[PDB]
Amino acid sequence: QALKKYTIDLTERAEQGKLDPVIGRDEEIRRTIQVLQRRTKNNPVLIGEPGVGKTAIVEGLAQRIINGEVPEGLKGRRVLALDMGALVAGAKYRGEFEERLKGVLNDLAKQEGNVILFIDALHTMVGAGMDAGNMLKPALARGELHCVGATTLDEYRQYIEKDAALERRFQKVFVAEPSVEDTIAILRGLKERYELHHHVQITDPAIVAAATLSHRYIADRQLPDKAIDLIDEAASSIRMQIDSPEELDRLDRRIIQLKLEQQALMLDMLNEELSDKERQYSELEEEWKAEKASLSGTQTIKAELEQAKIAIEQARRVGDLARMSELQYGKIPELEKQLEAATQLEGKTMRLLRNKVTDAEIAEVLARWTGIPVSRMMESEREKLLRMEQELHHRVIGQNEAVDAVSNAIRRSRAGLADPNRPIGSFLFLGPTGVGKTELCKALANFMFDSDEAMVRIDMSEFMEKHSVSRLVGAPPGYVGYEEGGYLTEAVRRRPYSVILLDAVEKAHPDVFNILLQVLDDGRLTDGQGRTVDFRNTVVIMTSNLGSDLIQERFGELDYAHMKELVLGVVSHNFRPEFINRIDEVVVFHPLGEQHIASIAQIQLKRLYKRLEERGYEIHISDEALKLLSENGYDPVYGARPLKRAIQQQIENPLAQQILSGELVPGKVIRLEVNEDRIVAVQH
Amino acid sequence: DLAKQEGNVILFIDALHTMVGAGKADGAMDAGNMLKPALARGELHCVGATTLDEYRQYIEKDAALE
Ligand SMILES: Nc1ncnc2c1ncn2[C@@H]1O[C@H](COP(=O)(O)OP(=O)(O)OP(O)(O)=S)[C@@H](O)[C@H]1O
Ligand SMILES: Nc1ncnc2c1ncn2[C@@H]1O[C@H](COP(=O)(O)OP(=O)(O)OP(O)(O)=S)[C@@H](O)[C@H]1O
């Protein structure tokens, strides 16, 4: 007829066990059971942030009607979830949709209030072509319909609160978003379910670490949805790593390599080596099959354990006498003890291993969701990270205080000791020009992301007027670029782990520094469209040169800390104490000596050799040429750039002059031997 | 016809940004309100292929399918 075609039951799917065990939520289940049992305004709608399981509340309502802990007025009801899909999908002719909706309402009236209708996404139903606003409002008025709604907080503002005559036939059953602890409980029930499904065993410290790390690092979505996502995705990872091994991959590639080599050689010895490696391959393959058979038997017996539990729940509802004692005291202790025998057998035989989900796989799925390096240290990465100063002294020579403070900050983030209310670090680099602020920050991005300018580099010398804050926040509502956010918040909400480099910060008007007060205090920055962005995982590096005369005047015969004190007073004269209180540590650079410039000359000549060698020419140098480049490139007030433009002149002008001249032959060695006063190439 | 395959078919939508609001008219279901149930229960194995700025424009304007 009508209530068979277009509606989907929940009480059948709560009876055949197809729905999930819904834990918690007894306050909101009780409030929905209240709102259903009134005389007017009888229809509730569930309104909450998207993800907290409004549909899960109604599925749990069906499970409590079946289990019968409801009051007597709703015992024996039927919950029919409504499908707009088929209803709209059949109506080719005019009025057929209203005919079908009228037929469904007549059969609802004929079922005489015994049916609780569940329309999820009610804002979809409100527009259907009168259509559905003017047709259910009779049954929404006279209390003969017991519709239950479920909608987002967003679409309840638009598609319902537009019209008050449809708005006040409903109730804001405001589903709260659960805290950490209720998320833990929900994950325990669904641990039971997903261990049935993905053939695994979820350790309970992985549940509490999944709850905490889902609350801390993902900030897009809403609990308890993200925690079930991390648990289910890590269980998927473990099922995949079981399903594949890698040792047999090495052995198969080795035996096919030696097989091709032996077939090419047909001294031998490789028949013997191939036979030994194929015996090793067959033994490991049989061990692989034995472990797969063991896990197969264990998960089939656990599935039979759950089928016994569903059958004993059938016996708890129905009430058979000997079936209760039979199922319980026969099936449960023997199956649980040979389950534990199979579990310790897998603890004996899993070598080749992992069939359980600890915290580490949760951390790996979290580090591949967002990008924050949460995971435990594989030893390539840990020895990579202990050599952090050794990784930065190949693109920054000198400047040890900087590399110390920076490497300290990165190490404090990767261990765990960081403060989750701040970014990792927030450095205010000072010092006169051409000593390596900007290349230190590019050295960080080259370490961390394996690319030089793969980082969010904001030029703070565009913000010389007050109205250009809005380039980085974005546009307030009802203006031009409101559809397109900022530049800072968008490119961080994409990739939460980056290095935001504020280029030469002292030029801007002080308002952008007020924006930075928000950022460096609490990692949040509400952009144009009214949403926060989690900056708790970046390294907001800000450069400057506010103490050039002071540092170039007194870095001699003054230690590091007192220099920091005196330049700290100078920056206090240029900034408000709000902003420089927020800073992690102002580190101070210093102008370069002669040997530092010699090393910089060596580095720049290395990249010049790189350029001309990928061109195809090969160049050696005399040490006297390097000494002339060191002596001409030295001056304090302009930093390490007179070295680069002296190199530019005294090599790149005559050398490019002669390479374009058709003179210098490819392949031969271009020797940069000095003249009496200059540097020139020769060819022999 | 994907339910009659029993999880055998990986459905590939290209331009997932397009799908939100495909058919919105006077009497419509918007094509996101017919895949929100089927995607909600995991019965469909859809694979999305969208841009990044099309993702800011089209899907995150609609959190229930985000
Ligand atoms: N308290 C809970 N107990 C058990 N499972 C829950 C709970 N909260 C959420 N879930 C699970 O979360 C998943 C989706 O929950 P839903 O409430 O259906 O999401 P939703 O409310 O439909 O969000 P939208 O905006 O409607 S898509 C299902 O797997 C539920 O079982
Ligand atoms: N300590 C250094 N080690 C290596 N290269 C350096 C060093 N200092 C400067 N350079 C070179 O000089 C350029 C970087 O100069 P920077 O010091 O970054 O200028 P800056 O730090 O922004 O100071 P200002 O604000 O520009 S005056 C690049 O070409 C580098 O190769």
Side-chain angles (χ1 to χ4, degrees), chain A residues 1-379 382-684, chain B residues 1-23 25 27-66:
Chain A
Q1 294 180 357
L3 292 173
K4 296 299 292 182
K5 306 292 191 296
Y6 305 108
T7 61
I8 300 167
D9 187 359
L10 295 181
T11 64
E12 178 184 1
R13 291 172 65 89
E15 181 175 1
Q16 299 182 0
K18 289 181 173 63
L19 301 171
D20 279 335
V22 179
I23 303 176
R25 298 294 184 185
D26 200 3
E27 181 180 0
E28 290 85 4
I29 291 173
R30 189 184 294 116
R31 195 168 195 271
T32 305
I33 296 169
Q34 288 182 359
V35 174
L36 286 175
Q37 290 178 354
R38 283 170 58 188
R39 188 181 66 83
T40 61
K41 291 183 183 180
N42 301 325
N43 293 316
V45 67
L46 294 165
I47 299 168
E49 295 94 0
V52 299
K54 294 178 273 284
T55 309
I57 278 178
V58 180
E59 290 176 351
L61 186 66
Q63 287 176 354
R64 280 187 179 178
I65 285 173
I66 295 301
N67 284 319
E69 297 184 357
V70 299
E72 292 289 332
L74 295 175
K75 290 183 178 291
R77 299 297 182 95
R78 296 295 176 184
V79 178
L80 275 69
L82 187 55
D83 188 0
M84 284 287 109
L87 286 173
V88 180
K92 186 185 285 185
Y93 297 94
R94 286 187 298 274
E96 182 178 359
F97 166 68
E98 288 84 3
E99 179 177 359
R100 292 187 184 186
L101 182 60
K102 182 181 178 181
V104 171
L105 293 173
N106 286 120
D107 288 338
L108 283 171
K110 189 175 73 175
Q111 289 296 320
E112 297 292 329
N114 202 4
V115 171
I116 296 171
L117 200 72
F118 166 67
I119 300 171
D120 52 350
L122 190 62
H123 64 89
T124 295
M125 190 197 73
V126 173
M130 192 69 205
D131 48 358
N134 293 114
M135 293 177 73
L136 277 83
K137 194 180 287 183
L140 266 59
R142 294 179 294 115
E144 292 178 352
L145 185 53
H146 290 81
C147 169
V148 177
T151 180
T152 317
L153 180 55
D154 295 328
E155 276 86 5
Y156 179 77
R157 182 174 64 244
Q158 293 175 358
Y159 300 164
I160 288 177
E161 291 180 353
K162 178 172 67 178
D163 179 77
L166 188 60
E167 190 273 336
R168 66 178 298 277
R169 299 291 183 270
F170 290 111
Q171 289 293 107
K172 296 177 74 169
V173 189
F174 178 73
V175 177
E177 185 184 6
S179 63
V180 179
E181 306 174 359
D182 298 340
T183 315
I184 292 169
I186 296 159
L187 289 175
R188 287 174 179 170
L190 301 176
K191 172 186 74 174
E192 186 179 1
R193 178 58 57 85
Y194 293 148
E195 283 183 356
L196 266 72
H197 185 271
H198 294 294
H199 306 76
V200 288
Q201 295 175 356
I202 301 167
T203 310
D204 194 78
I207 285 174
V208 65
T212 299
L213 295 181
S214 62
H215 183 73
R216 184 170 180 175
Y217 291 111
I218 298 178
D220 193 357
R221 293 177 186 176
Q222 285 152 352
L223 295 164
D225 185 74
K226 64 184 82 172
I228 298 168
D229 285 337
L230 295 181
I231 286 298
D232 195 6
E233 191 171 0
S236 292
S237 178
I238 293 300
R239 176 62 186 168
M240 279 178 61
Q241 294 180 2
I242 287 173
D243 202 7
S244 71
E246 286 78 357
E247 300 179 357
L248 278 79
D249 291 334
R250 298 296 178 271
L251 266 294
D252 195 0
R253 293 183 184 179
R254 188 183 294 270
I255 64 167
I256 197 67
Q257 184 63 254
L258 298 179
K259 181 69 181 295
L260 289 175
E261 185 175 1
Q262 184 176 358
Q263 189 65 42
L265 289 175
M266 293 301 291
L267 186 146
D268 295 331
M269 295 298 291
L270 190 55
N271 194 0
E272 192 270 331
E273 186 67 30
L274 183 65
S275 179
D276 195 1
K277 292 296 183 184
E278 284 179 353
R279 185 181 66 190
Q280 182 67 40
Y281 185 80
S282 179
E283 286 178 352
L284 290 176
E285 185 174 1
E286 184 64 31
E287 182 180 0
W288 184 66
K289 295 294 185 183
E291 292 170 354
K292 285 174 70 178
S294 177
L295 272 71
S296 176
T298 305
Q299 195 64 40
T300 52
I301 206 163
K302 191 175 288 183
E304 290 180 353
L305 184 64
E306 180 67 29
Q307 287 295 322
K309 288 183 180 179
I310 285 175
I312 201 165
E313 289 295 325
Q314 292 290 324
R316 287 176 186 174
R317 270 82 49 82
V318 174
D320 194 0
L321 272 298
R323 186 68 174 171
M324 286 296 292
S325 177
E326 182 178 1
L327 287 179
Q328 182 178 3
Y329 297 102
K331 307 300 290 294
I332 277 90
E334 65 184 1
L335 269 70
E336 285 178 353
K337 72 180 181 66
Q338 64 190 352
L339 180 65
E340 289 295 327
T343 300
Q344 65 187 356
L345 181 61
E346 291 179 356
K348 289 173 68 67
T349 194
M350 289 292 280
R351 179 183 180 273
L352 295 178
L353 276 175
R354 282 176 174 173
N355 50 5
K356 295 187 289 293
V357 176
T358 64
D359 51 356
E361 292 291 326
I362 292 298
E364 286 179 350
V365 169
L366 187 64
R368 287 176 291 173
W369 208 102
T370 65
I372 290 100
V374 178
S375 291
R376 69 179 299 278
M377 286 296 108
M378 61 180 289
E379 293 296 321
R382 191 175 68 185
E383 288 180 352
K384 178 183 174 73
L385 203 144
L386 292 176
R387 295 182 298 167
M388 185 58 205
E389 302 175 358
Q390 188 177 1
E391 279 287 331
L392 294 184
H393 280 284
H394 291 173
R395 295 188 66 191
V396 172
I397 208 64
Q399 304 299 320
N400 284 320
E401 299 292 329
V403 181
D404 279 334
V406 169
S407 301
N408 287 325
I410 301 171
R411 285 191 294 266
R412 287 187 291 108
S413 179
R414 298 292 178 92
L417 282 77
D419 194 359
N421 301 322
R422 289 186 60 190
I424 294 171
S426 67
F427 297 101
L428 182 62
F429 288 167
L430 303 181
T433 56
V435 303
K437 292 169 276 188
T438 308
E439 276 284 326
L440 180 65
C441 306
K442 294 172 185 175
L444 283 186
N446 197 3
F447 168 74
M448 187 177 290
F449 297 139
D450 295 333
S451 174
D452 281 331
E453 294 91 3
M455 70 191 299
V456 180
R457 176 169 174 172
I458 294 172
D459 289 328
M460 296 295 298
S461 63
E462 299 174 359
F463 297 155
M464 283 179 280
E465 286 296 326
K466 182 169 75 70
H467 72 286
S468 292
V469 164
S470 295
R471 184 171 289 117
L472 53 86
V473 167
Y479 286 98
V480 197
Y482 173 68
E483 293 177 350
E484 280 174 347
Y487 177 66
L488 180 55
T489 74
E490 285 292 328
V492 169
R493 193 178 65 86
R494 268 75 169 273
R495 297 300 299 162
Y497 182 68
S498 62
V499 174
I500 300 166
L501 177 62
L502 273 78
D503 196 359
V505 84
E506 81 280 12
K507 297 300 191 297
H509 210 268
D511 56 345
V512 194
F513 296 103
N514 292 323
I515 297 294
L516 296 172
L517 281 176
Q518 308 176 5
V519 168
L520 305 180
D521 196 4
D522 282 326
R524 64 182 298 278
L525 178 60
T526 299
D527 60 350
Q529 292 183 1
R531 66 186 185 273
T532 63
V533 180
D534 196 2
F535 286 10
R536 267 88 55 82
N537 293 315
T538 61
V539 192
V540 186
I541 297 168
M542 294 174 288
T543 61
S544 169
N545 57 356
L546 281 168
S548 296
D549 289 329
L550 185 66
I551 294 168
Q552 285 178 352
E553 185 177 1
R554 289 184 183 177
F555 189 76
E557 69 265 10
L558 275 76
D559 50 353
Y560 177 72
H562 299 167
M563 178 54 71
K564 183 182 289 186
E565 180 69 29
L566 193 55
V567 78
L568 190 62
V570 174
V571 176
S572 299
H573 287 289
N574 298 117
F575 280 154
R576 291 179 181 177
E578 282 173 348
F579 181 71
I580 71 170
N581 200 5
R582 304 284 167 89
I583 303 302
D584 196 1
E585 186 172 0
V586 176
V587 320
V588 179
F589 288 6
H590 59 89
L592 302 175
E594 291 83 1
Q595 53 186 356
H596 298 91
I597 291 172
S599 181
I600 293 167
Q602 292 175 355
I603 296 171
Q604 295 296 327
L605 284 169
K606 287 173 188 176
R607 72 171 60 195
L608 178 58
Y609 293 169
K610 178 182 176 181
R611 286 196 292 264
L612 281 163
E613 196 271 331
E614 290 173 350
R615 174 69 66 196
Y617 299 153
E618 295 182 355
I619 293 173
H620 293 171
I621 194 169
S622 175
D623 290 333
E624 187 175 1
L626 188 145
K627 288 176 68 65
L628 266 72
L629 290 177
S630 177
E631 288 294 326
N632 283 319
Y634 180 73
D635 44 355
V637 297
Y638 295 157
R641 277 164 167 163
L643 177 64
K644 285 187 67 178
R645 62 179 180 262
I647 284 167
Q648 175 180 358
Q649 295 173 357
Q650 302 178 0
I651 292 173
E652 292 173 350
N653 288 323
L655 189 63
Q657 171 62 42
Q658 294 175 357
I659 287 171
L660 279 166
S661 176
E663 177 177 357
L664 267 66
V665 181
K668 291 183 179 180
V669 177
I670 299 166
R671 291 177 288 175
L672 288 176
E673 297 174 352
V674 302
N675 284 321
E676 294 85 2
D677 290 327
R678 295 181 185 179
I679 302 169
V680 74
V682 294
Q683 282 294 109
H684 296 283
Chain B
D1 285 331
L2 292 179
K4 286 169 66 176
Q5 294 292 320
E6 287 293 329
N8 201 5
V9 174
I10 294 171
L11 196 68
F12 170 65
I13 290 173
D14 55 350
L16 189 64
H17 68 84
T18 301
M19 181 191 71
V20 288
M29 284 299 293
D30 200 76
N33 304 118
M34 298 178 71
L35 266 65
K36 196 177 294 182
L39 269 60
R41 291 182 286 123
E43 292 176 352
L44 185 51
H45 295 94
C46 177
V47 172
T50 185
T51 323
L52 179 54
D53 290 331
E54 270 78 2
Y55 179 74
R56 188 192 68 245
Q57 283 189 356
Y58 295 165
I59 293 174
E60 286 200 3
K61 260 56 177 298
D62 179 67
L65 193 46
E66 179 261 333

